[PDB]
Structure 1
Amino acid sequence: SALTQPASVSGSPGQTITISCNGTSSDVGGFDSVSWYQQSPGKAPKVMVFDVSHRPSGISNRFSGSKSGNTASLTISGLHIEDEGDYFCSSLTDRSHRIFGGGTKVTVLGQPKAAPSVTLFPPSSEELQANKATLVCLISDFYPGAVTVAWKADSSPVKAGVETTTPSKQSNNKYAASSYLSLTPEQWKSHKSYSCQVTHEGSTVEKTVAPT
């Protein structure tokens, strides 16, 4: 089980952004025990907000928490460079458990947004002769560093054999990611086409390869 959060939220320095956290009556809607955690790269998570709207000692007044029914919200006013990271909501359960949300990557825009460049490679003849097949989807030069990758065999989607990396900075401050679809040489020749579909900031790029 998991509370529901948007995958990516972004804003310019000084702007005000909001992160939603959808739960149920046995958690978020059941108690006033919603807490928020910030996780910076290479750093331990830290409490930002607890008991819906309360701030611990040393936490900036720019972080505020709110709740309406089964939904909790974290608001960040006057967005700062140091607020970048992953934000997780948590709640107490009616079973005395703790449930966390999926997380939200918060980007404080420091350069213009860029859509990804998608290059899809079919299995090489060298790999096919080794009785293996891998479709390689390279996603590069996008900003912010959050994308959704989906594969299709013909027009139907495929979740088996898919491995996607988490975006990482590509030296020039933009992010890159890669996704692989592992098949047997037989599966590869059994379907008419294969597609890698990449979604970034609501826009989508789809490249298609065929056994040729």
Structure 2
Amino acid sequence: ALTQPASVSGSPGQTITISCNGTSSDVGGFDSVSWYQQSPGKAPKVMVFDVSHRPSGISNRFSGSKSGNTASLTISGLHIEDEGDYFCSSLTDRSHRIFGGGTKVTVLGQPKAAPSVTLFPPSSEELQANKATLVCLISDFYPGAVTVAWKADSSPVKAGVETTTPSKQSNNKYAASSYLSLTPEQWKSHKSYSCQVTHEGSTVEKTVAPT
């Protein structure tokens, strides 16, 4: 997977750029980088191809570049209609295609808002039913993009993690939730379990413990 920023945000009129860091077997080994825009509930749409070229009838304020093994997509003079997810894609050494993980572009329309984070431990009722689940709840943030990283004690954790896509609350801010599925024995084994949400630079953290 080519590497994109989870999220990049700009205000209307401003100029913004999404990077696409690959390797010499893809981004750097060919000049066949394309970028796709997927809007909320739609099928992707080609925006750029062969690095810097634009398909017939696509705004000139979308342009592409490449230096070494990373490509870039630049959007000058952001409009609201640009909000969505964007994916880079490249030809590979094995004659395959490969996509970047994607970047949510938001066109800021209100002031930043830090997320409120609450983390619940396994209930007693669940542990007796021989299961365990940490539930990390996230609300009241703008823009609606967060990175959720889990840690058992001090060491990172990627197995059993499931995170939702941020949705708009009634207060026009965003909420997401993140679950870490454990076994009753894993939960009991460790000293603590932190849940770290990173939003627009800053990181709020909450922590829970077995007893």
Calculate the TM-score normalised by the size of structure 2: 0.93
Q: What are the Cα deviations for residues 4-51 of structure 1, in whole angstroms up to 9, with x where unaligned? A: 211111100000001111222222222221111100011111111111
* Larger mean Cα displacement after TM superposition, 158-167 or 118-127: 158-167
For 2:43 and 2:55, the matched residues in 1 are separated by 16
Q: 1:90 to 1:136 in 2, by over 3 A?
A: same
Q: 1:12 to 1:91 in 2, by over 3 A?
A: same
**Structure 1 portions without partners, runs of 5+:** none
Q: Does 1:22 align with 2:18?
A: no
Q: 1:127 to 1:72 in 2, by over 3 A?
A: same
Q: Residue 185 of structure 2 aligns with which residue?
A: 186
Q: What are the Cα deviations for residues 56-111 of structure 1, in whole angstroms up to 9, with x where unaligned? A: 11101111111122221111011000000111111122332212111111000011
What count of residue pairs does the alignment treat as equivalent?
211
What is the deviation of 1:121?
Answer: 0.8
**Structure 2 portions without partners, runs of 5+:** none
What is the deviation of 1:156?
Answer: 2.4
Alignment root-mean-square deviation, CA: 1.5
Q: 1:18 to 1:127 in 2, by over 3 A?
A: same
What is the deviation of 1:54?
Answer: 1.2
For 1:134 and 1:24, the matched residues in 2 are separated by 37
**Structure 2 matches for 1:15-94, cutoff 5 A?**
15-94=14-93
**Structure 2 matches for 1:35-184, cutoff 5 A?**
35-184=34-183
For 2:28 and 2:62, the matched residues in 1 are separated by 21
Moved segments of 4+, more than 6 Å? none
Q: 1:43 to 1:156 in 2, by over 3 A?
A: same
What is the deviation of 1:159?
Answer: 2.3
* Larger mean Cα displacement after TM superposition, 49-58 or 146-155: 146-155
Q: Give yes or no for contact 2:6–2:147 (8 Å, CA) kept in 1.
A: no
